[PDB]
Each structure stands twice: as C-alpha cells, then as structure tokens.
C-alpha cells in the first residue's frame, strides 16, 4: 500500500560537506526545495 | 565532539560533527571516504 517514510535533505545530498557547492546550488533557486518536495511528495502520495 | 565544527587535516577541509567510530586507520592511511567518494573521516596528523 505505502512505502517507508524517509527524509532526504536536498542540500546535503547534492552537496556533501562542500561550501562552494552550496554557493552554486543556491543559484539554481527552488530546485533544492523541489527535490525535498519531490521525495517527500512521493511519501505523501503513498499516504494518500 | 558532538558539535558542528570546521576540520582541516592534511588539506582535507570541510565542516562536520566530530564523532568516534570503529574506523581503524593504519599508520599509512590518510582519510576515509563514504559511499559517495567524499571525505567522511580524517586523522590527527600530529598524534595518532
């Protein structure tokens, strides 16, 4: 019926312990938040 | 330990929370890599 609840951080996932990475990642805008809403949205979709 | 701090050991710069794991660094080993091939463990070069 549903999957296992998980919470993957977009910042740490794309940029694992890197300062310059996060500086360029923030330039992309809300794509980081969309990654969280995407993986979380799947979990919420399974809850639906 | 148990605090977010900036590390600098043999050029392996980064930011993380220091913890004590079961990693047995040999006298020749410099630093440990995670599944993503990124530095997740270092060693004090002054004293083992």
Between chains, do A18 and B14 touch, taking CB under 8 Å as contact? yes
- Closest residue by Cα to residue B41 from B24, A12, B27: B24
Coil, strand or helix: which one is B11? Answer: coil
Q: Obtained via which technique? A: cryo-EM
b vs e for B7-32, b when ≥16 Cβ sit within 10 Å of the residue's Cβ?
eebeeeebebeeeeeeeeeeeeeebe
> For testing the chain B interface, which of A12, A14, A16 should be mutated: the one with the most B CBs within 10 Å?
A16
**Which tokens in the block code for residue B12?**
């392996």
Q: What is the 3-state secondary structure (H, E, C) of A1-48?
A: CCCCCCCCCHHHHHCCCCHHHHHHHHHCCCHHHHHHHHHHHHHHHHHC
Resolution, expressed in angstroms to one decimal: 13.5
Instruction: Give the number of C-alpha atoms closer than 13 A to the C-alpha of residue B4, restricted to the C-beta side.
Output: 2
Using an 8 Å Cβ cutoff, are B13 and B3 in contact?
Answer: no
Shortest distance between the Cα of A44 and any Cα of chain B, in A, equals: 27
Rounded to the nearest 10°, the torsion over CA A28, A33, A34, A37 is 170
For residue B39, the chain A residues in CB contact (below 8 A) are 17
Instruction: List the 7-46 stretch of B: residues with Cβ below 8 A of A.
Output: 14-16, 34, 36, 38-40
b vs e for A4-39, b when ≥16 Cβ sit within 10 Å of the residue's Cβ?
eeeeeebeeebbbbbeeeeeebeeeeeebeebbeeb
Element (H or E) spanning B33, and its range?
strand B32-33
């Amino acid at each position: 019926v549903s999957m296992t609840k998980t919470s993957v951080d977009c910042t740490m996932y794309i940029c694992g312990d890197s300062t310059e990475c996060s500086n360029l990642l923030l330039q992309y805008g809300s794509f980081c938040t969309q990654l969280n809403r995407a993986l979380t949205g799947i979990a919420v979709e399974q809850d639906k | 330990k148990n605090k977010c701090v900036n590390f600098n050991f043999n050029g392996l710069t980064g930011t993380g929370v220091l913890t004590e794991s079961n990693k047995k660094f040999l006298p020749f080993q410099q630093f440990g890599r995670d599944i993503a091939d990124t530095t997740d463990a270092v060693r004090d070069p002054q004293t083992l």
